[PDB]
């Protein structure tokens, strides 16, 4: 079948290597573009993701070399980035919260499962499919933290400041899954209240300092209803060991309370 190999780049996604949406010049089927001008980071990148395969994963479809720069085939993700459903100062309704946190854990849990660590959780690389099915995406700054079935601690200071675990900051060494559990407490923040909690987990931080202190009266808290509230004052721990780990998470009771309808069917009547 002639030209089945050949895409067309009609607009840009996102920047920092940069991605253009291509579509296909036959069947129109439309793909993420990631184009890398090398001129070692790109080679763990995609070496990380041809060994994942996962529905709340952004997929790979392969990559291509053409001298300098490197070309990464990713799945298009049509509802966008996780951070615009996110209503500055308000946040989303609270089921809708609920299903991208599941969503969020079934990714995370599958991840940590094959031992691997994202380390850049937040909303902007949480993408939605055309049904709203979030999708971890940008695998740039993860890695290994279990070969062989031996756990290897980190120490390379990786993310951003307003979604790192405390323990980065303030320890040489820690344990890879209770950064990325810390991260996804933070989206979760986002998410219910339209704002960040704090610019960085120190104690230099006012904000961070009056949650340690347990001042819930106080925002972004105070926008966040009693059982969600209770899942982040156990996600939200300054020590990492004391932190819920993800099997705990799933036995929360907002983590499992009946909140949202299922997608909207079409019906008739009488
Ligand atoms: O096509 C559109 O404009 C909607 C849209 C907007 C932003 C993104 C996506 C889709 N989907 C994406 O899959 C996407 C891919 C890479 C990067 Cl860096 C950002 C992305 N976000």
Redo the contacts with the bound molecule.
């Keep these: 079948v002639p030209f089945v190999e050949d895409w067309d780049l009609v ?1 840009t ?4 290597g940069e ?1 253009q ?1 291509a579509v296909n010049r036959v069947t129109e089927e439309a793909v ?1 573009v ?1 184009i890398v001008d090398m001129k070692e980071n790109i080679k763990k990148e995609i070496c990380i993701n041809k060994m994942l395969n996962h529905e709340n994963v ?1 997929k790979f479809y392969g990559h291509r070399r053409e001298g300098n720069i490197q070309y990464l085939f ?8 996780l951070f615009d459903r996110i209503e500055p100062d308000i946040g989303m309704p609270e089921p809708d919260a609920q299903r991208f946190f599941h969503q969020l854990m079934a990714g995370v849990v599958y991840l940590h499962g094959i031992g691997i660590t994202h380390r850049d959780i937040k909303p902007e690389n949480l ?1 939605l499919d055309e049904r709203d099915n979030l999708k971890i ?2 695998f740039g700054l993860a890695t290994v933290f279990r070969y062989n079935n031996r756990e290897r601690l980190l120490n390379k200071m990786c993310g951003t400041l307003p979604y790192v675990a405390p323990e980065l900051l303030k320890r040489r060494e820690f344990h890879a899954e209770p950064v990325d559990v810390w991260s996804c407490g933070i989206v979760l923040t986002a998410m219910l209240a339209g704002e960040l909690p704090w610019d960085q987990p120190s104690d230099s931080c006012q904000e961070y300092s009056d949650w340690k202190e347990k001042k819930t009266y106080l925002n972004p808290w105070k926008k966040i209803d009693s059982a969600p509230l209770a899942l982040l004052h156990k996600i939200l721990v300054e020590n990492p060991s004391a932190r819920i780990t993800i099997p705990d998470i799933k036995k929360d009771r907002w983590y499992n309370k009946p909140l949202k309808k299922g997608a909207k069917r079409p019906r008739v009547t009488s």
């Design positions: 607009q996604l996102g920047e920092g991605v949406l993420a990631k952004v990713l799945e298009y993700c049509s509802g966008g980035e993408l995406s940008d």
